[PDB]
Amino acid sequence: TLTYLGPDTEVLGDMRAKGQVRIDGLVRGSVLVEGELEVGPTGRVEGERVEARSVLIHGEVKAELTAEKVVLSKTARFTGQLKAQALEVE
Amino acid sequence: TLTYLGPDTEVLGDMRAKGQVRIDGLVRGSVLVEGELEVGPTGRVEGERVEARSVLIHGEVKAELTAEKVVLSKTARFTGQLKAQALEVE
Amino acid sequence: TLTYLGPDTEVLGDMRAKGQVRIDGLVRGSVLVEGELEVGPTGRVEGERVEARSVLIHGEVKAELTAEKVVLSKTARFTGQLKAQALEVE
Amino acid sequence: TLTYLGPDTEVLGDMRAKGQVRIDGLVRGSVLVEGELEVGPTGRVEGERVEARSVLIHGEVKAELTAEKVVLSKTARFTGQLKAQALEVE
Amino acid sequence: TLTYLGPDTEVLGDMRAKGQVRIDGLVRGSVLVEGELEVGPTGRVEGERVEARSVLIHGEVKAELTAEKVVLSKTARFTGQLKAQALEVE
Amino acid sequence: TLTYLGPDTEVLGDMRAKGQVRIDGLVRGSVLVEGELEVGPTGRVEGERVEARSVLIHGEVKAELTAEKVVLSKTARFTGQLKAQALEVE
Amino acid sequence: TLTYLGPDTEVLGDMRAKGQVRIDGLVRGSVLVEGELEVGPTGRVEGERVEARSVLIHGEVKAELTAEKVVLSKTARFTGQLKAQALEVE
Amino acid sequence: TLTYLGPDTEVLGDMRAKGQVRIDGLVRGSVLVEGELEVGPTGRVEGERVEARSVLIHGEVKAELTAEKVVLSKTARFTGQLKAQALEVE
Amino acid sequence: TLTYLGPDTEVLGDMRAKGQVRIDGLVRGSVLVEGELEVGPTGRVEGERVEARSVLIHGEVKAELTAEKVVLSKTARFTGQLKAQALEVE
Amino acid sequence: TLTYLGPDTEVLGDMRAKGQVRIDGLVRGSVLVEGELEVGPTGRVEGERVEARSVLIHGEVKAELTAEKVVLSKTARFTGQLKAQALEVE
Amino acid sequence: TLTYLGPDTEVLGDMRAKGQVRIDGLVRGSVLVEGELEVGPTGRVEGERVEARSVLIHGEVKAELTAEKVVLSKTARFTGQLKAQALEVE
Amino acid sequence: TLTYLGPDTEVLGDMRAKGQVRIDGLVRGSVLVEGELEVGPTGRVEGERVEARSVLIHGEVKAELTAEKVVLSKTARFTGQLKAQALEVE
């Protein structure tokens, strides 16, 4: 359950994972991880929906994120709708 | 127009400003500034709606944010919906 | 605490501040500063109650003012109840 | 009716006038003018109640003022309650 | 000192003036002018004491007059004690 | 009861009459008529006391007048204390 | 004036008249008429001195009468000294 | 003591009688009856002194009368001093 | 004319009567009756001259008697001049 | 680039990767990896096309395989077209 | 029909069998057994087409395999097209 | 090395074997067994050349037979060239 993607791992579809996810690549479609997510600095996640319980972002995301905790860093970039309950920065 | 509030400047209402705004205090209600807003580290903005063209955040916000550009810092905390076009940090 | 407001900073609520305040805009509601208040020539404070320890007025106030020292200028205009202990003009 | 008092015209009672009244002296008690009142710079009206439709003040007044229009000058000073509908200066 | 009262300028107290005084209205109480007093044809002064150096009467007086020179007219009608040194007419 | 004196009818004493009295002369002492009194223009009544129910004066009186009704004319002259209940002229 | 006194016109002093005098009352003291005197049937003249040019008596006289012509009537009464030049009756 | 004189009983001297005396004539001098004296209508008593305890006069007397009771009638005439205690007529 | 004197009727003068005269008293001076004279037993006529038409004597005469008829009685006494034409006794 | 998926990492799309890939989960769609691919014993790759330079299989594949070297294990299962140049086992 | 070939039984042509066939030798050409085929560890099947309902391989095949079930062992080696419905190993 | 073909095992080529061969099927082409050959009663071997050390025939052969020992049976049939050194029967 140590799922890792990217870079140059372009995927045109909807990933539906569980556990732990790190993303360094490009994703066209929806992500519905049931757990902790990580987005690397080389990551790009475009599409409609992002659902998780914990999201950590270093790259660009263009979707409708829906999680509880959302963490950002200096390299993060977002565009779109965002439903969170506690957004921190570090 | 260098409208500035806080600290100890508690306001129980809906502020509707314009231009450049810095807030270091507490606000219960909606903010509809047509310009640049900044929230200091002592700031707390609860209520329903926050709408602007440029937002820079150091404190707590609990509303339905709807802006274009949103800047954050390390001390920030947010809760609720966020409809932006460019979410960066620092 | 260098609180400054107005003009065009319309607020529909009750501000409850502390320290020193200047107001050049429009306020619908009560002001309860625990310190010095200032109203600019463009200021408008309608509503129920205005309470402070020092009041200096250049604009319009329509409420139940209750302070110790009340200063007026040539541009001032008032409507309503006023309980002071020393009313000066300058 | 050119009713005029003061200086050196101290009166210990409640005046109930009509028309136009000017006071440059001292009055202890109630004033109930049904018209325009004037207070000179040496005038002193202490006591409980002052009722008029127009009051012009240059001296000291300590009572419960209740009028429609109230005008003040640079030498004026007031203490107590003030129920007016239009308080101007000069 | 052109102190003038009356008519319709009723005062309920004890006037203590200086200089020259005319009354065409109602005064209930004592008058203690240190100079010339004048009572118009519509003037009426009831009460306890009237003291002056010169008193001129056209109306009704009900008190204890005490002056040096006392002048009367055809319309006067005094009531009470009168301690003068020269009671003249016209 | 047509009591009439004066002029040249000087009397050094206290007259105590009843009915109606006219005096055109000089009287040194008290007059105590129990009725109407009349003083002519050439009359002089000096002394302590003058008591009547009606006093009409054209001449000089220097005493303590004490009556109910007191009438004067342009030729009258008085000096001293005067206790009346209705002091009229002409 | 035709000086007439009495009745009930009691006088406690010295009358000194001129012309014509009639007395129907009581007189305590001296009479010094420079003319004709008459004492009515109710008249009483007690005292010290009575001097005249003509005295006609119907009442009581008790003094030092000194005149030229003295007339008496059936009702007359006298007591004391009488220095006259023509004492008649009727 | 039925002493009777007059008429035509003219006497140039001083009669000094006692008891009862009537005189119808002329007497030049003093009469000093120690009792009642009578002068008839034809009587004439000129002279200095006439003294008695009771004098009744119908005629002429020119003296200094000094008695207690002196009676006169319509025909009497007197000239001079008269010291009596009761002067009646008829 | 029943002229009668005495007793106790002393006269210091000259009696001059006309008619009938009785004397019971004292006469100091002359008697000149033009008629009948009588001197009672108590009578005394001293003086200058006694002239009459008829004299009847019971008392004392010390004068110049001069009559026509002169009668004396047992009680009579005379001293002086006597010119008569018929001196009888009893 | 040790890209790893599965288990429970279902993806409904076409992955186009590069480098080395291990899969223990489910993939619906085409895979176009430019390198070595590995399918774990729990791995499943259904869809249209799988193209690579080296494929090692422990799970199920139902597609059109096109590689150079193809290795299988005892747990492997395949269905469909396969154009390769070297199919070995273990 | 238990057709068996090999080793050293090379055939340069197209075999068309029916039933069950085992090959331990060399075949240059197409094999068209309509049943189960077996290739021994010494087997070599080159040529164009191999068609059966079951192919079991221990040797080398260089053709277009077309069966339903294809099983391999550790000694197998293949090159070319393979259309199966279940490719297993044992 | 018990090489066996037929029946229904049609082969379109040149078999070149070694050891022992039995054929019950159809063969169009050359046979070059280096040993003992057998053709069953259902066997048919047409073509150019059949070379062996021993040939046993129950079926049909149409070629250039060239062996050492050649055996036939009652059902056998041959057509063509035959180079043997001992052709026997049964």
PDB file of C-alpha atoms in Angstrom, chain G residues 24-78:
ATOM      1  CA  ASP G  24     -71.124 119.666  67.691  1.00  0.00           C
ATOM      2  CA  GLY G  25     -68.670 117.118  69.102  1.00  0.00           C
ATOM      3  CA  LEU G  26     -66.016 116.863  71.808  1.00  0.00           C
ATOM      4  CA  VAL G  27     -62.755 118.841  71.897  1.00  0.00           C
ATOM      5  CA  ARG G  28     -60.044 118.366  74.540  1.00  0.00           C
ATOM      6  CA  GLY G  29     -57.790 121.413  74.430  1.00  0.00           C
ATOM      7  CA  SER G  30     -57.697 125.073  73.467  1.00  0.00           C
ATOM      8  CA  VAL G  31     -59.556 126.778  70.615  1.00  0.00           C
ATOM      9  CA  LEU G  32     -58.088 129.903  68.974  1.00  0.00           C
ATOM     10  CA  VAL G  33     -60.513 130.787  66.180  1.00  0.00           C
ATOM     11  CA  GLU G  34     -60.003 134.157  64.483  1.00  0.00           C
ATOM     12  CA  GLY G  35     -63.698 134.749  63.917  1.00  0.00           C
ATOM     13  CA  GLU G  36     -67.159 133.503  64.814  1.00  0.00           C
ATOM     14  CA  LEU G  37     -67.450 130.215  66.719  1.00  0.00           C
ATOM     15  CA  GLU G  38     -70.544 128.113  67.402  1.00  0.00           C
ATOM     16  CA  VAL G  39     -70.999 125.173  69.779  1.00  0.00           C
ATOM     17  CA  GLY G  40     -73.946 122.930  69.016  1.00  0.00           C
ATOM     18  CA  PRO G  41     -76.301 121.396  71.566  1.00  0.00           C
ATOM     19  CA  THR G  42     -74.227 118.197  71.487  1.00  0.00           C
ATOM     20  CA  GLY G  43     -71.008 120.209  71.583  1.00  0.00           C
ATOM     21  CA  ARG G  44     -68.377 119.868  74.288  1.00  0.00           C
ATOM     22  CA  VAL G  45     -65.271 122.067  74.496  1.00  0.00           C
ATOM     23  CA  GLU G  46     -63.166 121.336  77.576  1.00  0.00           C
ATOM     24  CA  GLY G  47     -59.573 122.390  77.947  1.00  0.00           C
ATOM     25  CA  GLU G  48     -57.527 125.488  78.658  1.00  0.00           C
ATOM     26  CA  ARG G  49     -58.251 128.489  76.424  1.00  0.00           C
ATOM     27  CA  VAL G  50     -61.021 129.740  74.132  1.00  0.00           C
ATOM     28  CA  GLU G  51     -60.363 132.991  72.251  1.00  0.00           C
ATOM     29  CA  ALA G  52     -62.514 134.411  69.457  1.00  0.00           C
ATOM     30  CA  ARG G  53     -64.307 137.519  68.238  1.00  0.00           C
ATOM     31  CA  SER G  54     -67.791 135.968  68.561  1.00  0.00           C
ATOM     32  CA  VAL G  55     -68.921 132.854  70.451  1.00  0.00           C
ATOM     33  CA  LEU G  56     -72.412 131.329  70.340  1.00  0.00           C
ATOM     34  CA  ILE G  57     -73.049 128.466  72.749  1.00  0.00           C
ATOM     35  CA  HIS G  58     -75.646 125.703  72.855  1.00  0.00           C
ATOM     36  CA  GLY G  59     -73.444 123.046  74.480  1.00  0.00           C
ATOM     37  CA  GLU G  60     -70.774 122.720  77.162  1.00  0.00           C
ATOM     38  CA  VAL G  61     -67.629 124.860  77.414  1.00  0.00           C
ATOM     39  CA  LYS G  62     -65.032 124.572  80.212  1.00  0.00           C
ATOM     40  CA  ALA G  63     -62.104 126.935  79.580  1.00  0.00           C
ATOM     41  CA  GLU G  64     -60.936 130.554  79.877  1.00  0.00           C
ATOM     42  CA  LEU G  65     -63.259 132.182  77.364  1.00  0.00           C
ATOM     43  CA  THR G  66     -62.059 135.542  76.013  1.00  0.00           C
ATOM     44  CA  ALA G  67     -64.070 137.183  73.224  1.00  0.00           C
ATOM     45  CA  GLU G  68     -65.978 140.378  72.413  1.00  0.00           C
ATOM     46  CA  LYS G  69     -69.546 139.118  71.888  1.00  0.00           C
ATOM     47  CA  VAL G  70     -70.787 135.958  73.627  1.00  0.00           C
ATOM     48  CA  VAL G  71     -74.298 134.569  73.094  1.00  0.00           C
ATOM     49  CA  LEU G  72     -75.926 131.787  75.107  1.00  0.00           C
ATOM     50  CA  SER G  73     -79.009 129.601  74.673  1.00  0.00           C
ATOM     51  CA  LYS G  74     -81.365 127.625  76.888  1.00  0.00           C
ATOM     52  CA  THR G  75     -79.300 124.439  76.466  1.00  0.00           C
ATOM     53  CA  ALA G  76     -75.974 126.131  77.192  1.00  0.00           C
ATOM     54  CA  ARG G  77     -73.595 125.276  80.027  1.00  0.00           C
ATOM     55  CA  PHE G  78     -70.366 127.025  80.991  1.00  0.00           C
TER      56      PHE G  78
END
